[PDB]
Design a protein around this ligand. Structure first.
Ligand SMILES: Nc1ncnc2c1ncn2[C@@H]1O[C@H](COP(=O)(O)OP(=O)(O)OP(=O)(O)O)[C@@H](O)[C@H]1O
Ligand SMILES: Nc1ncnc2c1ncn2[C@@H]1O[C@H](COP(=O)(O)OP(=O)(O)OP(=O)(O)O)[C@@H](O)[C@H]1O
Ligand SMILES: [Mg+2]
Ligand SMILES: [Mg+2]
Ligand SMILES: [Zn+2]
Lengths: 636, 98, 650, 49
DNA sequence: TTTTTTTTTTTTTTTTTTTTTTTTTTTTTTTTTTTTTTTTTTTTTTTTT
DNA sequence: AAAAAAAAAAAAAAAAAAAAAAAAAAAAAAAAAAAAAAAAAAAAAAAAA
């Protein structure tokens, strides 16, 4: 229907003279600078934003979106043909692939004889000589689709879908162009690869071996061949776009090149790509016809809401003396009360600083167990923290138990062998694992959680598995202490009903009891009725921060390693020995150990991180001790 | 192709494909018959027989039924191509059924 | 070959008859309006009631049902002609328009067991349960290839030879130009139709109780693919056909059969309603007339066979109406479902109420104490074993999303199961994970549960805490908790017994005259239509299901229609209602709320405040109020006050 | 036939037909050479080539 | 311009070669699929002081 | 309440037959054409007053 020479001229014009004011209102020829970087081998992937193309050619964007492989090829050809005139100097031959490329170019010019007409099969394939990758950032005018609804009418189209990454393979070499050499001739044979499998060539087709009518057997070689980084990921529908009685639908995304190593399992991503078929050869198929598998060919992978990858006033509120309180009060502002609980949860999000002295690691993660009466927002707070934290996993009861927490060995699909997949504690490694209904958790899981919370590893020596998993996750647990309710007739450690080891692993065991109280029940009921009435928490002095903003603040506080002075050591020691003396003297106290002191230290370093200082001060210690004291306040 | 007279140029080897919608199919069931428990000699494994039922003999019986079968003792006729693997040292043997 | 047909007489006559049937203007206008409605809904399949054809054309109806393939080709050509007559551009958009069939297939209505070989090339209506679904795959029907050397563009057509003979020339994919220039396929310009295969099994409740199940394979093509998921109960109307085998010089005479669906419909003919203008007007007048005691009238009309339990019936009406989910902007969630627990003495009709809700509500799932254990109640994770990949499997509570789970003998469940129910009951979702997959399944279901107290009979001299055996966290999930006692008072006994004997005397009107209730022995069901997949006076005529003519009761069909309309209402808490509810909650949390020798049946937590809000919202929905007024709040508060306390005797 | 597509059935045994328009033909003549009359031995039939 | 011998020369065939066309044609392995075991990893009912 | 059991009960791996599918696959004979040569009849031009 359309002339592709005209379309290649169109895309060449767009690339050469599209400009914006991205750097401070300065017209900079957005794609010309990238073409320069591509010509100097300083940049591999070029992402073409179809919003830019629509700004000056909307029907080009529609053509791109309705036959996307064709236009990925056209754009790659335009870039190939534009690169020679954007080269300002000589490439330094970054790697071995470059050495091969420029030897091939050198030998082609050397024996050129330009006026001669060569065979169409006697040049280098285009993809053998690129060293750049071209991708589309789909137009914002295209609404994201639901994985279920990406069907046969969208084969060959540029679509965006959103989902959770459930399974992503390791980066592997996928061959793009197979290179062979001959035992007779000294030419190279090239086999561009489109299929999922190929039959390696046997004879060479070289001119010099066709003249000689020799054997000319050719030898497949990795050296001159071309590979690409390749990952296979599965991606699932979000819970909120699954129909009523259904389970979420997966799509296979074939990730390759510079788009690899972006998405890890558990990530919320938005993927732009082309929806393409893979022919289903071989299977003696019940139905006649050319049936094929589908996949998404990735072009742009963007990590979404919690997986997401400052103005002077922003730093102003960071430097505000009430920043800690404002962040803590932004924790699930629809739950009334629980002010100190939200402070403790904020500290869990920030965490302490890991210490590695002389080969003896002590974690920086903070663990918190909310053990409360029924209906006190424990599951709501757990769910909020799961929504907010960047690498969080939520588990409940025994729906994700055993290998849903640890790893399991699973049949690989890409090659077919036994690959290790992590459960919740691996997907939450270096994040938060929210373990709801902790008191009703299978004992094998509880022992695994012992090792996770202190050693930050999972050791497995079962039949198919002999490994040690990294599980460097904070544990936010929720439980009911004994028989559903806290009764004062029985001591702690009797209605807590956690062994001293497990109990001591938690930096804070927060006790919540909802004792009835007329004015307090009115305050809660008014808050809740307002929330039911307006779908939001009532106005207060300070508007709560967005979850994006909260994430940014917490992240900035994360890389803020503060140290403990020598001057505080006596103060901290006195606090520890004091806590320990109440534990001994009191008859209704929990188990106190050196873990209580480490809890003091890491709580206070998390406070200091929140002030974004580099040295823990006495007020940080003071607030940490107050938190440890409040954690058992309800029993008074 | 038997009709190579309606034109001088010829048809290939094996030109024929089954026309599935032009075939008259009938019902078809296979039964496993075991020797009656009272008829098995004392220390003795039971004997079995494969049964082949047809149009209205299909679904006339269910597993567990005691039946009396009347039929042709017959062998499978699928083309004297016996190339089995590890077992079957036996030559000239074909599967029996009724 | 290469022959064309010059005005085939039978195809011409058939297409004429079908276009006469479709062009309904001198007649009632049914199918002409239906074709307009598919044009406007942007669809390309018309579902035709075969009874309408029998009414208009016996000869067509019989010929269509017995020779399905060519008849359906004629009727789809006629449909395309008719659609073009109404709207030529729409007809231009879609290559072919399709025809699904529905209605009453007399002898063609079969089960997977009864679908024998005598129905080959006939239209059949098969009912069963979907055991396996394939992935939805695209099947290329028109491929477009560009030749970069010559700049030429090529198109190849692939005809649907699923059940026809397919010579290898019909399936070659072009890869080279005539002079061996490579072609590149234009994926975006090619046309694909997606293809699925499912297996339908004879429903376990309908299969002969002894033997193994019988199945049939079904080919689903575009528009029909994702209509059924494993575990669904479906009708599939389609053509039963032999598939071709591969090319070979030898054949056993054995053919592999499939059903090519022309229509798929869910058993849940209770999950899709049909409202005419008169129905809507009747609903609107019923809501406007008595907008005050309409709720009581609906409640007392709920399980008419059960006498008494007025509060329990009001609560069940609130459960069937529901509250409103709060979906906060930060993704936070407050549920809007009501969960009810019925504790009580033996034989007080709580199973009857569960059975009523099972036969009344849409998307209602039944489950008993130990008949659904572990993963059969929430979801499960299994491994595909063909691809080696993990798969999700939906349990009872996932399948009841936006529905009800009626858990009978709740006390005889395991504690493992009862603690698995917690997350579904409160947060409305199932979170399950094995190593290769983690999901969060929506189970937005309300739980109606019936249990017996410990000791089987409720001891009135012990506190309700120790008669119910449930811990406080579980009890908190159930927002209403009814103790249904067998008070052996003679007056109440007379009331109950008179009612029961009247229901044991009732005989259906004219349909019966002294005869017995048939067993329905698996050949009688296929004789008639299935009521499950089948195709309003606001009141019932009074005979002796009621003693005297003093107070009318709502028709069951109208009550289904009315509740379906009222469920969509989203009433808003007004400030007076919110203040009243808050004050009542603070009073109810306090000790003065309970006198001496009265005891709490369930704890009062913040969940009780949301219980009040949800009950008031459901009450407001019953009136179609759009606001939660003070009357709704005080009805909710009296429900809670009634259910949450119990006097203990000495 | 060279082309393979395992899902599709195979082509027949002898499937190939000369396409006459896609053929590079050249001129072609056959001659009859007789031994030169002055080269034939005396009582002797001439040879041909 | 009546008679009369070489000359072809059109018509029967026959040979006869060279070339193009015609005619003939199941068996044997392999593989997926289904339905079985079988070791191992849980996990769900058993009892005590 | 936990501690051994003692089953399901799921997976991976194996077998293990079937039953279907897939893969191999030129040379010998004939006829027709076009060309020759050969027996016969037929049609020419030299004879003379
Ligand atoms: N400040 C608050 N305190 C208590 N409950 C609240 C508060 N704010 C809101 N709620 C309500 O509590 C209800 C949820 O119960 P929740 O999620 O607290 O159970 P839980 O704390 O896990 O208790 P359980 O121990 O029974 O599991 C939510 O609907 C929420 O709206
Ligand atoms: N108002 C009523 N009160 C009690 N029983 C009634 C009433 N009306 C009818 N029944 C009859 O009582 C019989 C027994 O009721 P059902 O079996 O539902 O009791 P149940 O409460 O489930 O007993 P259990 O707790 O032992 O299961 C039913 O046949 C029902 O029809
Ligand atoms: Mg909870
Ligand atoms: Mg009952
Ligand atoms: Zn060579």
């Amino acid at each position: 229907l359309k002339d592709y020479a005209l379309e290649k001229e169109k895309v060449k014009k767009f690339l050469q003279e599209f400009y914006q004011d991205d750097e401070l209102g300065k017209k900079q020829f957005k794609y010309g600078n990238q073409l320069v970087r591509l010509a100097h081998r300083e940049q591999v992937a070029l992402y073409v934003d179809l919003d830019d193309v629509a700004e000056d050619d909307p029907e080009l964007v529609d053509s791109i979106c309705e036959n996307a492989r064709r236009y990925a090829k056209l754009f790659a050809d335009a870039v190939q043909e534009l690169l020679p005139q954007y080269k300002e100097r000589e490439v330094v031959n970054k790697d071995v692939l470059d050495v091969y490329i420029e030897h091939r170019l050198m030998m082609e010019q050397r024996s050129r004889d330009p006026g001669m007409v060569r065979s169409p099969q006697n040049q280098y394939p285009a993809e053998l000589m690129r060293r750049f990758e071209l991708y589309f950032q789909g137009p914002s005018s295209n609404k994201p689709r639901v994985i279920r609804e990406v069907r046969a009418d969208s084969v060959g189209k540029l679509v965006t879908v959103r989902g959770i990454v459930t399974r992503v393979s390791e980066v592997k070499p996928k061959m793009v162009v197979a290179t062979y050499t001959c035992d007779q001739c000294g030419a190279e044979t090239y086999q561009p690869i489109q299929s999922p499998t190929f039959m390696p060539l046997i004879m060479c087709p070289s001119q010099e071996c066709q003249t000689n009518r020799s054997g000319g057997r050719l030898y497949l070689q990795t050296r001159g061949s071309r590979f690409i980084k390749f990952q296979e990921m599965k991606m699932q529908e979000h819970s909120d776009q699954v129909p009523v009685g259904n389970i979420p639908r997966s799509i296979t995304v074939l990730v390759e090149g510079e788009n690899t190593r972006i998405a890890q399992p558990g990530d919320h991503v938005s993927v732009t790509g082309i929806f393409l078929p893979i022919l289903r050869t071989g299977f003696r198929q019940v139905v006649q016809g050319l049936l094929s598998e589908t996949y998404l060919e990735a072009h742009r992978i963007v990590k979404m809401n919690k997986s997401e990858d400052l103005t002077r006033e922003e730093l102003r509120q960071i430097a505000e003396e009430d920043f800690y309180e404002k962040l803590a009060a932004s924790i699930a502002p629809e739950i009334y009360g629980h002010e100190d609980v939200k402070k403790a949860l904020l500290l869990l999000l920030v965490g302490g600083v890991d210490q590695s002295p002389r080969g003896m690691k002590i974690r920086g993660n903070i663990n918190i167990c909310l053990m409360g009466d029924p209906g006190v927002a424990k599951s709501q707070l757990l769910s909020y923290i799961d929504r907010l934290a960047p690498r969080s996993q939520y588990t409940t009861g025994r729906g994700s138990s055993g290998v849903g927490l640890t790893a399991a060995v699973l049949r690989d699909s890409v090659s077919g062998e036994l690959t290790l997949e992590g459960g919740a504690l691996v997907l939450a490694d270096q994040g938060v694992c929210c373990i709801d209904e902790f008191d009703k958790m299978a004992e094998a899981d509880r022992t695994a959680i012992h090792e996770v919370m202190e050693q930050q590893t999972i050791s497995i020596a079962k039949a198919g598995i002999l490994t040690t998993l990294n599980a460097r996750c904070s544990i936010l647990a929720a439980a009911n202490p004994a028989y559903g309710r806290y009764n004062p007739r029985r001591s702690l450690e009797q209605n807590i009903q956690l062994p001293a080891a497990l109990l001591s692993r938690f930096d804070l065991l927060w006790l919540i009891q909802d004792r009835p109280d007329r004015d307090n029940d009115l305050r809660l009921a008014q808050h809740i009725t307002y929330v039911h009435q307006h779908s939001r928490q009532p106005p207060s002095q300070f508007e709560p921060l967005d979850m994006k903003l909260m994430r940014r603040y917490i992240a900035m506080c994360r890389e803020k390693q503060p140290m403990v002075p020598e001057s505080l050591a006596d103060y901290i020691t006195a606090a520890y020995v004091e806590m320990r003396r109440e534990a001994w003297a009191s008859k209704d106290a929990t188990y106190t150990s050196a873990r209580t002191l480490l809890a003091i230290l890491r709580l206070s370093t998390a406070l200091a991180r929140l002030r974004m200082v580099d040295v823990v001060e006495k007020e940080d210690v003071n607030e940490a001790i107050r938190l440890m004291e409040m954690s058992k306040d309800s029993l008074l | 192709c038997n009709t190579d007279q309606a034109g001088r140029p010829k048809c290939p080897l094996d030109p024929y494909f089954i026309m599935p919608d032009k075939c008259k199919c009938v019902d078809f069931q296979t039964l496993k018959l075991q020797e009656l428990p009272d008829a098995v000699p004392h220390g003795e494994m039971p004997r079995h027989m494969q049964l082949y039922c047809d149009r209205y003999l299909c679904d006339k019986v269910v597993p567990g039924n005691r039946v009396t079968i009347m039929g042709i003792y017959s062998i499978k006729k699928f083309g004297l191509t016996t190339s089995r693997g590890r077992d079957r040292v036996g030559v000239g043997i074909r599967s029996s059924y009724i | 070959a290469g022959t064309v047909v010059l005005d085939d007489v039978e195809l011409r006559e058939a297409q004429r008859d079908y276009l006469d049937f479709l062009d309904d203007e001198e007649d009632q206008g049914i199918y002409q309006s239906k074709v307009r409605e598919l044009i406007s809904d942007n669809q390309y399949r018309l579902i035709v009631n075969v009874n309408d054809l029998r009414r208009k054309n016996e000869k067509r109806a019989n010929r269509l049902l017995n020779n399905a393939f060519e008849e359906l080709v004629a009727f789809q050509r006629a449909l395309k002609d008719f659609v073009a007559s109404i709207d030529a551009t729409y007809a231009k958009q879609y290559e072919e328009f399709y025809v699904g069939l529905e209605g009453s297939f007399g002898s063609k209505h079969v089960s997977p067991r009864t679908l024998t070989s005598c129905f080959l090339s006939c239209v059949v209506c098969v009912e069963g349960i979907v055991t396996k679904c394939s992935l939805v795959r695209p099947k290329v029907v028109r491929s477009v290839h560009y030749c970069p050397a010559t700049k030429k563009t090529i198109e190849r057509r692939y005809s649907d030879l699923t059940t026809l003979v397919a010579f290898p020339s019909s399936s070659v994919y072009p890869t080279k130009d005539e002079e061996n220039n490579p072609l590149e396929t234009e994926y975006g310009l090619s046309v694909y139709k997606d293809h699925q295969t499912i297996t339908i099994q004879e429903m376990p409740e309908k299969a002969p109780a002894g033997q193994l199940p019988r199945s049939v394979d079904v080919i689903l093509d575009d528009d029909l693919v994702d209509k059924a998921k494993p575990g669904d109960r479906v009708q599939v109307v389609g053509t039963y056909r032999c598939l071709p085998g591969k090319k070979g010089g030898y054949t056993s005479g054995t053919f592999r059969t499939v059903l090519i669906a022309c229509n798929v419909k869910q058993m849940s003919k209770d999950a899709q309603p049909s409202f005419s203008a008169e129905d809507i007007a009747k609903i609107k007048k019923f809501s406007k007339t008595r907008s005050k005691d309409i709720f009581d009238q609906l409640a007392k009309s709920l399980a008419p066979s059960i006498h008494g339990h007025d509060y329990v019936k009001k609560a069940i009406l609130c459960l069937l109406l529901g509250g409103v989910e709060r979906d906060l902007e930060n993704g936070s969630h407050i549920r809007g479902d009501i969960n009810i627990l019925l504790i009580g003495d033996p034989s007080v009709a709580k199973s009857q109420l569960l059975r009523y809700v099972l036969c009344t509500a849409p998307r209602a799932i039944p489950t008993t104490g130990r008949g659904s254990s572990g993963v059969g109640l929430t979801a499960a994770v299994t491994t595909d074993q063909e691809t080696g990949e993990r798969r999700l499997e939906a349990g009872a509570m996932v399948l009841a999303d936006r529905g009800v789970v009626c858990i009978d003998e709740f006390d005889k469940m395991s504690d493992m199961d009862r603690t698995a129910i917690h997350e579904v009951m409160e947060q409305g979702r199932v979170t399950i994970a094995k190593a290769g997959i983690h999901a969060r399944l929506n189970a937005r279901c309300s739980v109606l549960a019936a249990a017996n107290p410990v000791y089987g009979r409720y001891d009135q001299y012990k506190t309700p805490m120790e008669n119910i055996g449930l811990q406080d966290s579980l009890l908190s999930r159930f927002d209403l908790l009814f103790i249904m006692l067998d008070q052996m008072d003679p007056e109440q006994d007379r009331e109950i017994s008179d009612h029961v004997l009247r229901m044991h005397r009732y005989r259906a009107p004219g349909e019966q005259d002294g005869d017995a209730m048939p067993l329905g022995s698996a050949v009688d069901i296929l004789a008639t239509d299935d009521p499950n997949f089948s195709q309003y006076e606001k009141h019932d005529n009074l005979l002796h299901g009621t003693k005297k003519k003093k107070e009318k009761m709502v028709s069951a069909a109208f009550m289904k229609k009315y509740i379906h309309v009222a469920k969509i209402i989203k009433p808003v808490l007004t400030q007076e209602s919110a203040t009243y509810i808050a004050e009542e909650y603070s009073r109810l949390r306090s000790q003065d709320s309970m006198s001496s020798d009265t005891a709490r049946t369930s704890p009062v937590t913040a969940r009780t405040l949301e219980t009040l809000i949800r009950l008031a919202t459901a009450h407001a929905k019953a009136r179609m109020s759009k606001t939660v007024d003070l009357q709704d709040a005080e009805e909710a508060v009296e429900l809670v006050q009634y259910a949450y306390f119990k006097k203990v005797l000495e």
